[PDB]
A paper describes a structure:
Complement component 5 (C5) is a protein in the complement cascade and a part of the innate immune system that has been clinically validated as a therapeutic target for several immune-mediated diseases including generalized myasthenia gravis ([name]). Activation of these pathways results in cleavage of C5 to C5a and C5b. C5b initiates the formation of the membrane attack complex (MAC), consisting of C5b, C6, C7, C8, and multiple C9. Herein we describe the discovery of zilucoplan, a synthetic macrocyclic peptide that specifically binds to human [name] with high affinity, blocking its cleavage by C5 convertases and the assembly of the cytolytic membrane attack complex.
Numbering used by the authors:
A (entry chain B): 2 to 16
B (entry chain A): 982 to 1122, 1135 to 1305
Write the structure that this text describes.
């Protein structure tokens, strides 16, 4: 499991 | 250490294990062979980590300086009579490659002194034959602006790294004009990659310019993060509004963009912001010290080295 790509999100989400 | 992989790899006389294929006899391959040796020397010298060697410090410093010097002689084989550089010996000159050679030689000058006049000749060739009136750079003979933004940023990086060796007014002027092209054409952005390379290039000059600060803030608004507060921070190459998905694995353009974001932030001394970025880069690094390709590898190594000197 590559944890650094688990639950990644945009810090300033467009919506 | 963050610089542990390249340090071990350079001291062993082995390659840094970049994933991409570098053709034998290409100028890029030779430039990339001297790259890891420089950043090691730069870390050991500037950080004062000759302590690492319990044998003879002066003999080991001389041994690296010799390797650094051997890399320089190899790069000179790709230099033309007009002091431009070619990707293959005897092939036509490349503005891109000439800009890449100036970055490496400009950096190496710090510890192994270059021929000042030779660097001047390469800089003047670059500025007088391949900078347009608008300040952008072209190569030898929406999508157009992206290409122009990329090459200009890449060329500005090369010129900035070699500038103190040959600070002539014609070159100073070229930088002013090239910087103004980047300041005027970077926002609104078309990709995070082009935004990031522009930001880093501008970060090597006047860090107080208002449009440079808007470009940087626009880049920070493209940040991907994991955790709350962020444990990791990184960038992908496409803007959120063009592609609002979150990435599942790494790429070359992702690491390169992230590296330019990191180097921009270190030049602004934003040490709190950077820790989650180096954490991510540290895990994307391969055994040996390399990443996916050449340009993501050079800038990521620079980022890791400069962070290590700033923090340790
Ligand atoms: C290991 C793992 C699999 C799927 C999703 C996550 C967040 C982690």
């Amino acid at each position: 499991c590559v944890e650094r790509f688990c639950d990644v999100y945009w810090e300033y989400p467009a919506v | 250490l963050l610089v542990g992989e390249i340090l071990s790899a350079v001291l062993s006389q082995e390659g840094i294990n970049i994933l991409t294929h570098l053709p034998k006899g290409s100028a890029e391959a030779e430039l990339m062979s001297v790259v890891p040796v420089f950043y090691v020397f730069h870390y050991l010298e500037t950080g004062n980590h000759w302590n690492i060697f319990h044998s003879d410090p002066l003999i080991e410093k001389q041994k690296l300086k010799k390797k650094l010097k051997e890399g320089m002689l190899s790069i000179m084989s790709y230099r033309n009579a007009d002091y431009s550089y070619s990707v293959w010996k005897g092939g036509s000159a490349s503005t891109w490659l000439t800009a890449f050679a100036l970055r490496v030689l400009g950096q190496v000058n710090k510890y192994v002194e270059q021929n000042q006049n030779s660097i001047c000749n390469s800089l003047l060739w670059l500025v007088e034959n391949y900078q347009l009136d608008n300040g952008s750079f072209k190569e030898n003979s929406v999508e157009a602006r992206e290409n122009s933004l990329y090459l200009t940023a890449f060329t500005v990086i090369g010129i900035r790294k070699a500038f103190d060796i040959c600070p002539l007014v014609k070159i100073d002027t070229a930088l002013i004009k090239a910087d103004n092209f980047l300041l005027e054409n970077t926002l609104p952005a078309q990709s995070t990659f082009t935004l990031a390379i522009s930001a880093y290039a501008l970060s090597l000059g006047d860090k107080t310019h208002p449009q440079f600060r808007s470009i940087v803030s626009a880049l920070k608004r493209e940040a991907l993060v994991k955790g709350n507060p962020p444990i990791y921070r990184f960038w992908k190459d496409n803007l959120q509004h063009k592609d609002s998905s979150v990435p599942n694995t790494g790429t070359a353009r992702m690491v390169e963009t992230t590296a330019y974001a990191l180097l921009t932030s270190l030049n602004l001394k934003d040490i709190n912001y950077v820790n989650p970025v180096i954490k991510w880069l540290s895990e994307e690094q391969r055994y040996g010290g390399g990443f996916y390709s050449t340009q993501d590898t050079i800038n990521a190594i620079e980022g890791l080295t400069e962070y290590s000197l700033l923090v340790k």
